[PDB]
Design a binder for this molecule. Structure first.
Ligand SMILES: O=C(O)[C@H]1O[C@@H](O[C@H]2[C@H](O)[C@H](O)[C@H](O[C@H]3[C@H](O)[C@H](O)[C@H](O[C@H]4[C@H](O)[C@H](O)[C@H](O[C@H]5[C@H](O)[C@H](O)[C@H](O)O[C@@H]5C(=O)O)O[C@@H]4C(=O)O)O[C@@H]3C(=O)O)O[C@@H]2C(=O)O)[C@@H](O)[C@@H](O)[C@@H]1O
Ligand SMILES: [Ca+2]
Ligand SMILES: [Ca+2]
Ligand SMILES: [Ca+2]
Length: 487
């Protein structure tokens, strides 16, 4: 699998998920270098805590590396690619990247989704593998202790969460229970689904969506305002983690491991590992998947789904003096041996090739830490350009977790996600000038609403004014225009 005759050292700026950078001595990166003869060296800031700021600051310094990578960079790969900071990959892929060329061959909608208005491919994306993403999970051992049954609608959800709060299910005499926790703060806004309001059109938070041939953004609709009215009341009543916006990554380890949380919306595989992982420290701990409790409008909504392609990956800068070797290095991660390490880690360390496929073995499968959390720490399952393989995830999907997935599929609960729109140069330019600005202001207002710093009703009108003056509806007009060119 070597691509270059002499070892090639490339500078990567890859800051992702507000917590991590590329490591040259990751066991997977050490194995990457070993298989490809291409070494990557991180120039990103270790200690920094905002991946988008780091990309921006890097762009602002004029000092680019050879490779830029990370999560949530699709819009910037496209915008700065058109400006000439990243090179178009079309001819390189066609001539030097066969596995990628074969992937786009059998995945034409992926290649279309990641392209720029000028028709150029400016990064290689992270391609997820799977169907469902998040579901709802509740403490059945608390339900049992309190003599409750799983909630079937929002009315019963409220009653059950109230009981977790008020009737001491951990039995320590203290009102320490925190009914709803989530390691992703944006899930608190997705709670508006339970009153029949969208929070996002996709697995990307605050995403647009299509409603009957009309592009909308969910946080602009009156339905969102009404939903936030109940969400704010829940926060006020202490049903939602007071620290929901600041606890973040390790909220499961903290709130479940400390026997404080009763309820969450998270991924099936990893969340269900905690039953085993906490089996000794919290005797009797048992999370179960439940169907989405029927919302106030009489429907069961699972808004989240696995994406066909995520807005993450890596790109080749103009400064890169070895574009050919780099694109071959990219191609490695769409080949079977690249998929092997990027999904499974290091052979003889986390997996072996058994019957022609990577099979994990048992030190990893039984860790109290979910398998994908272990793989991050060694450089696998990271948002480079690589073709994820659901076989890696099936191997640590417990039977109880699998029964949840099957329930959600059978039940039809998973709403189809927004696949995107193909804008023109002018349309996407308006999108570039306004959306990030609008998205930030939206988040700050909702955090305010959830926490009770501002009232939803009393600020809704001035909110809609800001939406209009900051260009939200002009962005919508341009997306609709591009949607109409497809419909
Ligand atoms: O666990 C399993 O069962 C399965 O997990 C699968 O991997 C999932 C993980 O479970 C998580 O879902 C992971 O979430 C990532 C996500 O991909 C994004 O990278 C997201 O990006 C957020 C940024 O890190 C940052 O927090 C950002 O802050 C915003 C802020 O929200 C607000 O907008 C403000 O105005 O602006 C800031 C800003 O950036 O300036 O928010 C981003 C966002 O909006 O969410 O970060 C999370 C994360 O966990 O950190 O995604 C992976 C995945 O691969 O998709 C998978 O491994 C599967 O196989 C497992 O079975
Ligand atoms: Ca899929
Ligand atoms: Ca208690
Ligand atoms: Ca602007």
């Amino acid at each position: 699998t070597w691509v270059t005759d002499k070892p090639l050292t490339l500078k990567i700026h890859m800051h992702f998920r507000d917590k991590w950078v590329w490591d040259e001595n990751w066991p997977v990166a050490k194995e990457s270098f070993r298989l490809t003869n291409v070494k990557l060296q991180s120039v990103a800031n270790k200690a920094a805590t905002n991946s988008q700021e780091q990309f921006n600051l890097m762009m602002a310094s004029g000092d680019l590396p050879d490779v830029v990578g990370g999560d949530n960079l699709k819009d910037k790969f496209i915008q700065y690619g058109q400006e000439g900071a990243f090179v178009p990959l079309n001819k390189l892929i066609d001539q030097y990247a066969p596995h990628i060329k074969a992937f786009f061959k059998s995945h034409p909608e992926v290649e279309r989704a990641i392209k720029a208005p000028d028709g150029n491919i400016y990064f290689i994306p992270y391609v997820p593998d799977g169907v469902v993403a998040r579901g709802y999970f509740i403490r059945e051992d608390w339900l049992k202790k309190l003599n409750l049954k799983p909630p079937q609608n929002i009315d019963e959800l409220y009653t059950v969460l109230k009981a977790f709060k008020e009737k001491d299910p951990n039995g320590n005499g203290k009102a320490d229970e925190v009914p709803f926790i989530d390691r992703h703060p944006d899930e608190v806004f997705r709670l508006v689904n339970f009153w029949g309001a969208r929070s996002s059109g996709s697995d990307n938070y605050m995403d647009f969506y299509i409603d009957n041939g009309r592009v909308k953004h969910p946080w602009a609709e009156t339905a969102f305002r009404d939903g936030m009215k109940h969400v704010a009341q829940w926060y006020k009543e202490g049903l939602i983690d007071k620290e929901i916006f600041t606890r973040k990554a390790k909220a499961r380890e903290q709130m479940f491991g400390g026997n404080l949380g009763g309820f969450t919306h998270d991924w099936f595989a990893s969340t269900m590992t905690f039953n085993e992982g906490l089996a000794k420290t919290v005797p009797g701990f048992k999370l179960i998947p439940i169907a989405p409790p029927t919302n106030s409008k009489g429907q069961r909504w699972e808004e989240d789904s696995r994406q066909k392609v995520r807005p993450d990956g890596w790109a080749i800068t103009v400064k890169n003096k070895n574009p050919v070797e780099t694109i071959k290095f990219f191609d490695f991660y769409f080949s079977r041996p690249g998929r092997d390490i990027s999904n499974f880690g290091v052979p003889g360390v986390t997996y072996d090739i058994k019957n022609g496929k990577a099979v994990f073995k048992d030190s990893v499968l039984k860790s109290p830490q979910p398998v994908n959390n272990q793989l991050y720490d060694m450089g696998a399952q990271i948002p480079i350009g690589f073709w994820q393989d659901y076989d890696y995830e099936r191997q640590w999907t417990t039977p109880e977790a699998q029964a949840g997935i099957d329930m959600y599929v059978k039940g039809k609960y998973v709403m189809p996600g927004f696949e995107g729109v193909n804008m023109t140069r002018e349309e996407r330019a308006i999108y570039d000038k306004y959306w990030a600005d609008v998205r930030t202001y939206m988040y700050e207002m909702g955090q305010a609403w959830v926490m009770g710093t501002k009232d939803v009703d009393k600020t809704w009108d001035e909110y809609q004014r800001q939406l209009k003056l900051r260009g939200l509806y002009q962005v919508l007009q341009m997306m609709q225009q591009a949607y109409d060119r497809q419909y």
